[PDB]
Tab-separated table of C-alpha atoms and ligand atoms in Angstrom:
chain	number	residue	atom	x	y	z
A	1	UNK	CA	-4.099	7.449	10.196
A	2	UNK	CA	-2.106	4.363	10.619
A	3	UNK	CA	-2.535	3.438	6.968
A	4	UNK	CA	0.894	6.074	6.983
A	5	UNK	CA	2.938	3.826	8.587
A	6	UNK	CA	0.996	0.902	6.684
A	7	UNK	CA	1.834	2.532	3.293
A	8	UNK	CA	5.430	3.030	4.336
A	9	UNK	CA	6.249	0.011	5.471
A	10	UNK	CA	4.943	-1.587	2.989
A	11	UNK	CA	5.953	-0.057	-0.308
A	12	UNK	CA	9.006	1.394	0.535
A	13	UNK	CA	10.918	0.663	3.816
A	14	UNK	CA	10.063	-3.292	3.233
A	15	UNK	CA	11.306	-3.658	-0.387
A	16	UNK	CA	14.397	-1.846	0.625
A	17	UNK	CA	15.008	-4.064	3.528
A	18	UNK	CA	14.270	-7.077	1.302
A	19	UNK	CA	17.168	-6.091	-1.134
A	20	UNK	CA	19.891	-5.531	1.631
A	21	UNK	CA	18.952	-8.378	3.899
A	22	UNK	CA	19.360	-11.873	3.275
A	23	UNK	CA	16.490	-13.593	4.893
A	24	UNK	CA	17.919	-15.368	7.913
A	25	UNK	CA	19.437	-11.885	8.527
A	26	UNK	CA	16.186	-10.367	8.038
A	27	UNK	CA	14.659	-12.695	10.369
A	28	UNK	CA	17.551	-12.435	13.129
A	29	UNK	CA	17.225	-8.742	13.014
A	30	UNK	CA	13.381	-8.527	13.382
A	31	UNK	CA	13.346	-10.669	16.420
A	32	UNK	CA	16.314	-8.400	17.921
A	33	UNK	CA	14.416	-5.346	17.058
A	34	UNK	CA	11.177	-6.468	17.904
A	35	UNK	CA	12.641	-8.093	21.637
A	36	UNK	CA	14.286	-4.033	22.213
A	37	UNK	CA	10.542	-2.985	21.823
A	38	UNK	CA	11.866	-0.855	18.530
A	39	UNK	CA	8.816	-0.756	16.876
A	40	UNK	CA	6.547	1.455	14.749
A	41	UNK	CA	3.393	2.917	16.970
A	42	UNK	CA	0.354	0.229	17.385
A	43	UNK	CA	-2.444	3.071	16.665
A	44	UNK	CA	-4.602	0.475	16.639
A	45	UNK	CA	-6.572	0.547	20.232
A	46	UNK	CA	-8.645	-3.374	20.284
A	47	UNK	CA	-12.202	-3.138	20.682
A	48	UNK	CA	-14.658	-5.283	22.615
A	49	UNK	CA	-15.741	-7.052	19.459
A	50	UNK	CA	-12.657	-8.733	18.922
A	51	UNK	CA	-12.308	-10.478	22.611
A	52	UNK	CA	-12.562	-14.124	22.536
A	53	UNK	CA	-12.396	-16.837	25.325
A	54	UNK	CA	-11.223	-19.862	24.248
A	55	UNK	CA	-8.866	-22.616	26.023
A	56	UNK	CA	-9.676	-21.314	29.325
A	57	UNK	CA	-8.260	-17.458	28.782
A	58	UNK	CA	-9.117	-14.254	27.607
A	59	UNK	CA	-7.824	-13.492	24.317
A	60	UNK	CA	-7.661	-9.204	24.169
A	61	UNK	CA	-8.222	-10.224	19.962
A	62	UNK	CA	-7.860	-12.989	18.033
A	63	UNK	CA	-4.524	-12.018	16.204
A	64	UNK	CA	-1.257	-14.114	16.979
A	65	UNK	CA	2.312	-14.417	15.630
A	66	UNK	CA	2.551	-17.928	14.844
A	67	UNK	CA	5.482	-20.668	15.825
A	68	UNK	CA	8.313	-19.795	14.442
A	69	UNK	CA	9.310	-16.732	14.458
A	70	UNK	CA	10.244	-16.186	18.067
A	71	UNK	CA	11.885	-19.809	18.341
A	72	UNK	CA	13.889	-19.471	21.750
A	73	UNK	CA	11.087	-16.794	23.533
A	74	UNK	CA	13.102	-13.955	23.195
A	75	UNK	CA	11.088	-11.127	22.146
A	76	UNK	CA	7.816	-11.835	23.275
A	77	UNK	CA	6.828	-8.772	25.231
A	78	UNK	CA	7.821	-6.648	22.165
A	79	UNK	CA	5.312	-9.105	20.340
A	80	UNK	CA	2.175	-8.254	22.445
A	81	UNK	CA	3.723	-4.336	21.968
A	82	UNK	CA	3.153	-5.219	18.042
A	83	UNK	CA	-0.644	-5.910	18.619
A	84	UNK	CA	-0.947	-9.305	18.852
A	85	UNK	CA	-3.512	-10.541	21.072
A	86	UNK	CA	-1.502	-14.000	22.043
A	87	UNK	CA	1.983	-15.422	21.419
A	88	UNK	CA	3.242	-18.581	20.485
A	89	UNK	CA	7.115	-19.576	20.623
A	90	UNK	CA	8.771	-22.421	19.762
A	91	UNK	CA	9.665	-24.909	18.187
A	92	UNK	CA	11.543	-25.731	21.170
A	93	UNK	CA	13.476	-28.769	20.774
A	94	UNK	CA	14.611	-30.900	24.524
A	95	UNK	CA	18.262	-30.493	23.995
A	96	UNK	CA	19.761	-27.111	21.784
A	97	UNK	CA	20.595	-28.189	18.266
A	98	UNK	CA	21.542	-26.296	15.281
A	99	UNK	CA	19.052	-27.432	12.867
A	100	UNK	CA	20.007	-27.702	8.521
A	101	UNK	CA	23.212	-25.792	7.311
A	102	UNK	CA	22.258	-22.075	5.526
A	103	UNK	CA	20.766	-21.189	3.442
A	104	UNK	CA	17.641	-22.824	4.667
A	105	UNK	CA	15.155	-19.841	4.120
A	106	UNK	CA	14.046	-18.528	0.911
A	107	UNK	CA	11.818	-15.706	0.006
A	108	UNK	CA	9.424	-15.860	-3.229
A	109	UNK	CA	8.363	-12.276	-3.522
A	110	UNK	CA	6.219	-13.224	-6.584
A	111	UNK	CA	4.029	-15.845	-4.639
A	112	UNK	CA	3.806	-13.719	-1.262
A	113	UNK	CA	5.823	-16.953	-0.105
A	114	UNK	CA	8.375	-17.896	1.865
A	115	UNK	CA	10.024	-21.292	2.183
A	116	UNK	CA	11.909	-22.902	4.652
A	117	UNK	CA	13.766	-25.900	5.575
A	118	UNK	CA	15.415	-24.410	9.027
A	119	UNK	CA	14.978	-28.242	10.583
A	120	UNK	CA	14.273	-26.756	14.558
A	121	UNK	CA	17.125	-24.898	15.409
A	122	UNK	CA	16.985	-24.375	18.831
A	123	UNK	CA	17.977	-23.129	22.028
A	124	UNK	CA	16.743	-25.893	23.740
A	125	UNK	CA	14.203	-26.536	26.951
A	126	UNK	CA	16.643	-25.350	29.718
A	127	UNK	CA	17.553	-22.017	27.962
A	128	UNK	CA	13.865	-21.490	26.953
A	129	UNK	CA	12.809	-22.497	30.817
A	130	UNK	CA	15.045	-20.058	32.378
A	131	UNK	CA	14.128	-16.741	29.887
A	132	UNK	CA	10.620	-17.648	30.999
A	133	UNK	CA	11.074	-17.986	34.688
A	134	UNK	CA	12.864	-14.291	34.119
A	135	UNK	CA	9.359	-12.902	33.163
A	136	UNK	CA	7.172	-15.431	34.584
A	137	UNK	CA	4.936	-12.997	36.652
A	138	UNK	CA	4.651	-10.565	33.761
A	139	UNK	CA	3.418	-13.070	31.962
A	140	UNK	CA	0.899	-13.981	34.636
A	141	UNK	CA	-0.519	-10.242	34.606
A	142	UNK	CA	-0.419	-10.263	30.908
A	143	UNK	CA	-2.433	-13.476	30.465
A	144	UNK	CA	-4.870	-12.242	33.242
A	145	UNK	CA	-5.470	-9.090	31.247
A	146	UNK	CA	-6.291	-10.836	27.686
A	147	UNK	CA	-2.405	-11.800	26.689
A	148	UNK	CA	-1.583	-15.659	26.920
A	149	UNK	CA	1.312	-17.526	25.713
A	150	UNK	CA	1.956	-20.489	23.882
A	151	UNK	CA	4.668	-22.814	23.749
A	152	UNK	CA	5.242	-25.305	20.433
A	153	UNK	CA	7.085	-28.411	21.370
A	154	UNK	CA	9.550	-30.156	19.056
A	155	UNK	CA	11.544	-33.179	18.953
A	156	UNK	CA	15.380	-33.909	18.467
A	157	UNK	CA	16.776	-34.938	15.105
A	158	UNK	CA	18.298	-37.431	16.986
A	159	UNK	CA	16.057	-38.589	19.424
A	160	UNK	CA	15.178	-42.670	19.298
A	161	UNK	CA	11.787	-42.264	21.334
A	162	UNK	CA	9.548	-38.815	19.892
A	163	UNK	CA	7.094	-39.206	22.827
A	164	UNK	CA	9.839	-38.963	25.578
A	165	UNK	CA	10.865	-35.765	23.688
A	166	UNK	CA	7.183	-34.268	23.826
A	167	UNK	CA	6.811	-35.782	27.603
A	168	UNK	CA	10.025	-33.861	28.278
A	169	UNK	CA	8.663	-30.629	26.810
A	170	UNK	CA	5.824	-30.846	28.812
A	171	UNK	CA	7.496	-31.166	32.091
A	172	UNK	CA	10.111	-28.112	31.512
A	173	UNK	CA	7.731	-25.611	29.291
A	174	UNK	CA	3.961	-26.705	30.046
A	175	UNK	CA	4.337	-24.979	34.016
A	176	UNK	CA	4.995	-21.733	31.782
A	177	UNK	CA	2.398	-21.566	29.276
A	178	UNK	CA	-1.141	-21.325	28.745
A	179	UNK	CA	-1.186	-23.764	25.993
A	180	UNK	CA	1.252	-25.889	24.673
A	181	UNK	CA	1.482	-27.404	21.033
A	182	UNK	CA	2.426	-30.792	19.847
A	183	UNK	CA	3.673	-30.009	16.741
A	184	UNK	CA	3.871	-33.453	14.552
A	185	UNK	CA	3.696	-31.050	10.984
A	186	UNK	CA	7.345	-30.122	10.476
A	187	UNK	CA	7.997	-30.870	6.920
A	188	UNK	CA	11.743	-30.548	8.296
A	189	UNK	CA	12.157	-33.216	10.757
A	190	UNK	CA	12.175	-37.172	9.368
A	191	UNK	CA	9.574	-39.071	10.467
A	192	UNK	CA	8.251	-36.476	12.131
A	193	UNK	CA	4.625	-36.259	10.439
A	194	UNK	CA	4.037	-40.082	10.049
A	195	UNK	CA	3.456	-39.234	14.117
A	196	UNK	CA	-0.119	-39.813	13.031
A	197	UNK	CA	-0.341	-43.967	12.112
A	198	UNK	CA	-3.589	-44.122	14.309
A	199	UNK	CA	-2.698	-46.319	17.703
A	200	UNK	CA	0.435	-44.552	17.446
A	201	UNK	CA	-0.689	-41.175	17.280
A	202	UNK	CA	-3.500	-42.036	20.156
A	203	UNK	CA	-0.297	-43.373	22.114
A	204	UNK	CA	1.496	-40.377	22.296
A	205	UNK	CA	-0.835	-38.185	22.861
A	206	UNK	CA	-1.807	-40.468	25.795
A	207	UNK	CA	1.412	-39.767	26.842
A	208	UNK	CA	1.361	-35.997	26.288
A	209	UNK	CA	-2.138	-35.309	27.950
A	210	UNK	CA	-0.856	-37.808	31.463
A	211	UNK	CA	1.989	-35.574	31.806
A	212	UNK	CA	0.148	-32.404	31.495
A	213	UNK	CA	-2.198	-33.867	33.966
A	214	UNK	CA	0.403	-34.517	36.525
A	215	UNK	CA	1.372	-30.825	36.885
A	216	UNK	CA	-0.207	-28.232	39.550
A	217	UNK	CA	-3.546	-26.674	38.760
A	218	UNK	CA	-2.425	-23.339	38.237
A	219	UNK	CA	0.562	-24.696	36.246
A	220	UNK	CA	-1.906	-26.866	33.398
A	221	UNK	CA	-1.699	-25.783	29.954
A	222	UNK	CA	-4.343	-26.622	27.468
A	223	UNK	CA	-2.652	-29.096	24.501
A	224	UNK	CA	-3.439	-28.471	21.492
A	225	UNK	CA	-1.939	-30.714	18.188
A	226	UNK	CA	-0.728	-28.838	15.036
A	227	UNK	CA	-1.139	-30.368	11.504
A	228	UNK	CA	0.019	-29.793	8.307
A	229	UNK	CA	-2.403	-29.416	5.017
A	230	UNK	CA	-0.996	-32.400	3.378
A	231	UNK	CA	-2.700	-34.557	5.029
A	232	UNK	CA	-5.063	-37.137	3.659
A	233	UNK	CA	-8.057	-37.623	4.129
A	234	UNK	CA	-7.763	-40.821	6.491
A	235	UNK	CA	-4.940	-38.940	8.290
A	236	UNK	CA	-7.674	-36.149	8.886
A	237	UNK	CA	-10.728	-38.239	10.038
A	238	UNK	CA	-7.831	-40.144	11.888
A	239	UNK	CA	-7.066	-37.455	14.100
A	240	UNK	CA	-10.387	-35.902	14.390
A	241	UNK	CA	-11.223	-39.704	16.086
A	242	UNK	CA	-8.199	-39.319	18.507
A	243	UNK	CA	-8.881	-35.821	19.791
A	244	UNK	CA	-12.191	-36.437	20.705
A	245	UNK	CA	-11.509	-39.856	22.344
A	246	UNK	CA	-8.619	-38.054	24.669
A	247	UNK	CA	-10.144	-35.250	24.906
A	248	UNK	CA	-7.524	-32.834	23.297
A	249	UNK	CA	-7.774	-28.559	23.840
A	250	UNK	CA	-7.744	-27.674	20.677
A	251	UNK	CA	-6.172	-28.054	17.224
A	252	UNK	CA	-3.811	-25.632	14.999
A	253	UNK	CA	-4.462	-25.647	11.403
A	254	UNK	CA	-2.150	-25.400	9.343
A	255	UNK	CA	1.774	-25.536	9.298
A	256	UNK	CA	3.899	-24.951	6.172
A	257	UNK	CA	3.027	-27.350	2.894
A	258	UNK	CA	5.273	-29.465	1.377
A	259	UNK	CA	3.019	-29.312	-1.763
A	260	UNK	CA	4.109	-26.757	-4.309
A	261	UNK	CA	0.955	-25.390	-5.781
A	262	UNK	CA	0.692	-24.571	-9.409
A	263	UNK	CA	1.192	-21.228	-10.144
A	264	UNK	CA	4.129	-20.350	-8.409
A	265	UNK	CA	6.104	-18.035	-10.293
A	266	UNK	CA	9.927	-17.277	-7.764
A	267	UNK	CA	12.785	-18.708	-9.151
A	268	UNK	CA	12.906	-20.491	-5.648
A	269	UNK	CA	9.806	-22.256	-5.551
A	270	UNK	CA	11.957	-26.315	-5.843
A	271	UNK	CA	13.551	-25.329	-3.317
A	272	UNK	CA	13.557	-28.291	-0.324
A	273	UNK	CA	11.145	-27.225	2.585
A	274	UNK	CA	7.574	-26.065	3.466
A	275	UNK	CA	5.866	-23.374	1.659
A	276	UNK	CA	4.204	-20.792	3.698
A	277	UNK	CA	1.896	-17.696	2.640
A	278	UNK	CA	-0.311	-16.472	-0.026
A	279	UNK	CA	0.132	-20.055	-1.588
A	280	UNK	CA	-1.224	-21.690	1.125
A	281	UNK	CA	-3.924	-19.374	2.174
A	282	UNK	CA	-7.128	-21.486	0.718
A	283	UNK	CA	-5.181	-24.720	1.407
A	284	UNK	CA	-5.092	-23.732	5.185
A	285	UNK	CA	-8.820	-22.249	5.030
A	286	UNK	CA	-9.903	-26.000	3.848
A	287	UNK	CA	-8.358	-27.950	6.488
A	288	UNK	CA	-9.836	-25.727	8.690
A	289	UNK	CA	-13.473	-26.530	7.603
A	290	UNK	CA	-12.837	-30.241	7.356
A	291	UNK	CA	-11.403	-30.137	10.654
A	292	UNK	CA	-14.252	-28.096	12.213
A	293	UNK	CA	-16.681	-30.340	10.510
A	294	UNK	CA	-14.963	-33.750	11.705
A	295	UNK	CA	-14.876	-32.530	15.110
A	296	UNK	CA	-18.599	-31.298	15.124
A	297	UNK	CA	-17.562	-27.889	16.135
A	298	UNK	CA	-16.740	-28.813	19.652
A	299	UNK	CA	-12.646	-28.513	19.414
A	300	UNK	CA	-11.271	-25.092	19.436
A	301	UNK	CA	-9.437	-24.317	16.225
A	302	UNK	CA	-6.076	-21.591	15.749
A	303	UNK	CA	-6.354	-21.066	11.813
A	304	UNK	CA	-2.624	-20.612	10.158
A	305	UNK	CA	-1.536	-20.255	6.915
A	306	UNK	CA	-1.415	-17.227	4.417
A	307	UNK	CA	-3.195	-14.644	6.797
A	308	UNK	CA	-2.512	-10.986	5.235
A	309	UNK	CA	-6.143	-9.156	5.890
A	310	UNK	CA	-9.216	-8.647	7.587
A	311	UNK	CA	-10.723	-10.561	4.630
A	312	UNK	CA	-8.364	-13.647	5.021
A	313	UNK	CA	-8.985	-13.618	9.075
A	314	UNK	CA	-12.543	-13.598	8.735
A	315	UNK	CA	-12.690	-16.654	6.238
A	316	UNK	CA	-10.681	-19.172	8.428
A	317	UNK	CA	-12.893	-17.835	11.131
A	318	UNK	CA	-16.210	-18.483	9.179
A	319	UNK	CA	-14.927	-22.049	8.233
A	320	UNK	CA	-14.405	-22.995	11.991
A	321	UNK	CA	-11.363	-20.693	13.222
A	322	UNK	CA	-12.082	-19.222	16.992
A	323	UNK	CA	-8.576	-18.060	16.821
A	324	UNK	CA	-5.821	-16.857	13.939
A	325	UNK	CA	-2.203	-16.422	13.396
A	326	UNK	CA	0.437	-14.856	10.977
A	327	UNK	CA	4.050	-15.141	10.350
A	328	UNK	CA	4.510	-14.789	6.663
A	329	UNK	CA	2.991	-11.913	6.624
A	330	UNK	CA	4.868	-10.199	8.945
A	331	UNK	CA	7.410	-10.943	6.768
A	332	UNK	CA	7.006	-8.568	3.920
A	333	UNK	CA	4.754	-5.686	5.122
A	334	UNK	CA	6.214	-5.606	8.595
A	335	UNK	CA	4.503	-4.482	11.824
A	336	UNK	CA	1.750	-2.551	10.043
A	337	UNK	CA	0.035	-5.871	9.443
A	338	UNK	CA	-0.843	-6.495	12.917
A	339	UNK	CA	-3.257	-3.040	13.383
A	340	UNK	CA	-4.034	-3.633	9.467
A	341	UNK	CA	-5.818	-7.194	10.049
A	342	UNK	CA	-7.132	-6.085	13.244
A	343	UNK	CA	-8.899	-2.691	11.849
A	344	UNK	CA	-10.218	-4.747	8.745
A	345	UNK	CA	-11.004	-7.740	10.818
A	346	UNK	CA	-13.568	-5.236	12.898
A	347	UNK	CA	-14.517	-3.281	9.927
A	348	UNK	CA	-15.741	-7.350	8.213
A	349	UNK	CA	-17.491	-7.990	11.202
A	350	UNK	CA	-19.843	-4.968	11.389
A	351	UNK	CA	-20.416	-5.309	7.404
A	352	UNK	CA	-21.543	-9.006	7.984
A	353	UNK	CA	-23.885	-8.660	10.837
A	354	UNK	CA	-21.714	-9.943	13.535
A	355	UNK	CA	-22.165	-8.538	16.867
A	356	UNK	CA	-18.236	-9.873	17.684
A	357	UNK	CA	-15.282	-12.433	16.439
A	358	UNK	CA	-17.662	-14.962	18.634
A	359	UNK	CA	-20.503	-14.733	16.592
A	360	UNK	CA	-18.574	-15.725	13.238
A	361	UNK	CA	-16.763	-19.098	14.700
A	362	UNK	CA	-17.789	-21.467	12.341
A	363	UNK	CA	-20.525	-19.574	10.687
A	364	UNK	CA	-20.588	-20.522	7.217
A	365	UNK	CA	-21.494	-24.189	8.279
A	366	UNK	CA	-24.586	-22.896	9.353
A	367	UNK	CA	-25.854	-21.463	6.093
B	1	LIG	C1	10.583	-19.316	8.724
B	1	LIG	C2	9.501	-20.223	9.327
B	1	LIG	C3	9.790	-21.015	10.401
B	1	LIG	C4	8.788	-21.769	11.020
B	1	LIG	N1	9.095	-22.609	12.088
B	1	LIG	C5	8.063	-23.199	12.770
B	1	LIG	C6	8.274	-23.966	13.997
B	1	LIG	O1	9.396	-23.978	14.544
B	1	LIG	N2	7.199	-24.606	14.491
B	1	LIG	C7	5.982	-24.623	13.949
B	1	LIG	O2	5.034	-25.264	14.456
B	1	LIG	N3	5.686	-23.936	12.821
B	1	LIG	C8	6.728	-23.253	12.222
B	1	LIG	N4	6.437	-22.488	11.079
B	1	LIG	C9	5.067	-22.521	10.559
B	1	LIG	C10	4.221	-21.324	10.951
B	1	LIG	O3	3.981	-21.405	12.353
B	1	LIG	C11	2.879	-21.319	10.241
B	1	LIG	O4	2.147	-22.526	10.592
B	1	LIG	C12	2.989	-21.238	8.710
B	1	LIG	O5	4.135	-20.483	8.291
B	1	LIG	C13	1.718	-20.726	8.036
B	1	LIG	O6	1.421	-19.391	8.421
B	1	LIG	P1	1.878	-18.129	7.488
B	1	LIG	O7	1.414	-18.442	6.082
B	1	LIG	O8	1.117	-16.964	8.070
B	1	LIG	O9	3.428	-17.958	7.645
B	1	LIG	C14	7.455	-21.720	10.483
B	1	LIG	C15	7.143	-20.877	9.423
B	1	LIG	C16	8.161	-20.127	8.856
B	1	LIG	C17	7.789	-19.232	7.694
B	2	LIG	O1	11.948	-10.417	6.377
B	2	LIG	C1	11.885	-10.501	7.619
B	2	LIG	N1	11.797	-9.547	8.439
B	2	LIG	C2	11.470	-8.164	8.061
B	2	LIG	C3	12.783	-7.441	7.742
B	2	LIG	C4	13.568	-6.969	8.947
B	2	LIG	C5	12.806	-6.033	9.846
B	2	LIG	C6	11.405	-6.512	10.023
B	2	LIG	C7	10.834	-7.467	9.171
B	2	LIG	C8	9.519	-7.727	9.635
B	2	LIG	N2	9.299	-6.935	10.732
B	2	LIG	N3	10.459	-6.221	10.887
B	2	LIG	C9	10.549	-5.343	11.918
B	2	LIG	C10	10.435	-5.742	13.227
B	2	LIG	C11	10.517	-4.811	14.305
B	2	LIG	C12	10.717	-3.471	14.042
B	2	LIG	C13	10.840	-3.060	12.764
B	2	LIG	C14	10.756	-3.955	11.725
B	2	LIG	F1	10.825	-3.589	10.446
B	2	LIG	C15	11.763	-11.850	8.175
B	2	LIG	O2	11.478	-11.958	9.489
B	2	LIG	N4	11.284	-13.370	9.763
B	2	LIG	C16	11.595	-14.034	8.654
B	2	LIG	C17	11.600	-15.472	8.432
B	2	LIG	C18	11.692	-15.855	7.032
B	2	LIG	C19	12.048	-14.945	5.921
B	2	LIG	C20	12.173	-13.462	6.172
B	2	LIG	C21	11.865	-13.113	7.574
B	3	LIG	C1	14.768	-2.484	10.618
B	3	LIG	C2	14.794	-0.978	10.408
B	3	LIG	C3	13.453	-0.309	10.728
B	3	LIG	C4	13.254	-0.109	12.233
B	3	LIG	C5	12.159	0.910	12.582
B	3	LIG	C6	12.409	1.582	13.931
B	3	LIG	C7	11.168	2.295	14.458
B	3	LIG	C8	11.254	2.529	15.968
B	3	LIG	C9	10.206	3.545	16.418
B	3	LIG	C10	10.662	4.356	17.631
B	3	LIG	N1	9.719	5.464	17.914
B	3	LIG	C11	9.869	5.883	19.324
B	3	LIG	C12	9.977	6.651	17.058
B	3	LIG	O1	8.557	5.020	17.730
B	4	LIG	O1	7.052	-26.924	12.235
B	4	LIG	C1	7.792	-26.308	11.432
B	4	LIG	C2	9.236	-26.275	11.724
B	4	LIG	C3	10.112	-25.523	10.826
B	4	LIG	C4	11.549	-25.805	10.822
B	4	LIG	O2	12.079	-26.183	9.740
B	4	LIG	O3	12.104	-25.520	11.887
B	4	LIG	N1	9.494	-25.228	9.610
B	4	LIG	C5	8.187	-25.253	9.386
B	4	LIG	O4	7.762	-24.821	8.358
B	4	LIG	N2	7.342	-25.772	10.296
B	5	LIG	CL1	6.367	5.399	14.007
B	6	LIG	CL1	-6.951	-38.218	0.205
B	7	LIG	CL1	10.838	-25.572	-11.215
């Protein structure tokens, strides 16, 4: 049983790990592991119930490793090896910068939590372009057998014009991916999430969806716009209005919070940055209804934020989710999680009546 490794992972060789490694280390050496393919056995074999086809691909299930982890695509084979049924990389910033000055990451074992204020560090477009084009036609087999990739796009510190940043990103990364992501949720950027004042917003997205349009057919992505939970509720109905009118792929819901939700017990919790996690769990599961709602069910939704079951996958997936992801998880019960959420994921489904992950999308707005 794979609950073994599960158990192991999680209530020994993770809390061990967690006391040695500080957690930019920790995250350095999981991505260097995890790109060497150094990882526990996946016993978990997907089933037939958890396909879904969404965005124009095959998804093999609906478990991904969110943006953020793998920043510079370094280690994304050994992320499919993991389980995941799609990956995302990024933020990818047009030029490399360094991001904020360390620490910058901050672990709140108490909350499940994590925050972080890491400000895009990146290896920029070129660098990103060319460790693509080095596995370009695995990729192609991979996405053609259930595995697609994402790319999230990010913008400069410095940069005096956000949509020529996106634009760029489009150009260099969108002839590589099967969907790309217009992140305007940092909490870590200035400015950055005020990229929703409406016209604005509706102009560079424009902007975004005319360069997508001008590549080669076989080289489109789907574009899909990533939001944080703090929104308001104007911001919300705000974008809702703009992705229908251009026509947008699909929406990911939610990036960190900048909120700090009562409760939280780690001595880091006022700490600068965005709060990821059990914390932000329900948050996350909320915007995803209002979203789905506002939208009328016709924009494909990725549901993020404090994914660490079957139980938690399965709720953003009733409240509108065709898709989920995980980082934080990851993060303190290690590979395990992957076949964990998957297994319990299935296990939900068959409980609840549902013949697959299809059959759930949205369904507690039909009740
Ligand atoms: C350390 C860290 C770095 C992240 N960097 C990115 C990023 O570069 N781009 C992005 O869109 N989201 C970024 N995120 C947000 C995650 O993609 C995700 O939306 C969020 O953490 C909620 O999911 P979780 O609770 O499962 O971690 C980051 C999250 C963490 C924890
Ligand atoms: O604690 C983090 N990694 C743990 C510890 C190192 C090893 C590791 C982790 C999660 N899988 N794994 C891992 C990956 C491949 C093979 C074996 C592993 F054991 C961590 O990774 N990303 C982060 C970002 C923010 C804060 C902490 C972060
Ligand atoms: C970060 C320290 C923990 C790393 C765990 C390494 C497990 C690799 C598994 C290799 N093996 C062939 C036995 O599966
Ligand atoms: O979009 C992002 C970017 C990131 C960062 O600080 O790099 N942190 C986040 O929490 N979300
Ligand atoms: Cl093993
Ligand atoms: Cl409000
Ligand atoms: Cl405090």
């Amino acid at each position: 049983m794979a609950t073994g490794d599960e158990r192991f992972y999680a209530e020994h060789l993770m809390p061990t790990l967690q006391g040695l490694l500080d957690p930019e280390s920790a995250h350095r050496l999981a991505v260097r592991f995890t790109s060497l393919g150094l990882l526990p056995r996946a016993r978990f074999q997907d089933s037939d119930m958890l396909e879904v086809r969404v965005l124009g691909h095959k998804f093999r299930n609906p478990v991904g490793i969110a943006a953020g982890f793998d920043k510079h695509g370094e280690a994304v084979d050994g992320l499919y090896k993991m389980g995941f049924g799609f990956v995302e990389i990024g933020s990818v910033t047009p030029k490399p910068q360094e991001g904020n000055p360390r620490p910058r990451v901050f672990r709140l074992p108490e909350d499940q939590a994590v925050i972080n204020r890491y400000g895009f560090n990146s290896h920029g477009l070129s660098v990103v372009e060319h460790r693509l084009r080095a596995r370009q036609q695995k990729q192609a087999k991979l996405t053609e057998d259930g595995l697609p990739l994402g790319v999230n796009l990010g913008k400069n510190k410095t940069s005096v014009d956000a949509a020529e940043d996106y634009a760029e990103g489009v150009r260099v990364l969108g002839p590589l991916a099967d969907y790309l992501v217009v992140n305007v949720s940092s909490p870590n950027t200035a400015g950055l999430r005020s990229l929703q004042g409406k016209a604005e917003l509706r102009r560079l997205l424009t902007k975004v969806l005319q360069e997508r349009d001008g590549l080669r057919r076989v080289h489109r992505p789907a574009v899909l716009v990533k939001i944080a939970p703090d929104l308001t509720s104007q911001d919300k109905e705000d974008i809702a209005s703009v992705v229908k009118e251009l026509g947008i792929d699909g929406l990911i819901v939610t990036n960190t919070t900048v909120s700090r939700p009562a409760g939280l017990q780690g001595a880091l919790r006022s700490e600068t940055g965005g709060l990821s996690g059990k914390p932000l769990r329900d948050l996350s599961t909320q915007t995803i209804r209002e979203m789905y709602a506002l939208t009328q069910g016709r924009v494909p939704i990725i549901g993020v934020g404090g994914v660490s079951s079957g139980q938690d996958a399965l709720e953003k997936i009733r409240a509108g989710a065709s898709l989920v992801q995980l980082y934080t998880a990851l993060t303190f019960w290690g590979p395990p999680v992957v076949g964990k959420v998957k297994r319990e994921l299935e296990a939900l489904l068959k409980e609840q009546g549902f013949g697959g992950v299809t059959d759930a999308i949205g369904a507690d707005h039909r009740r």
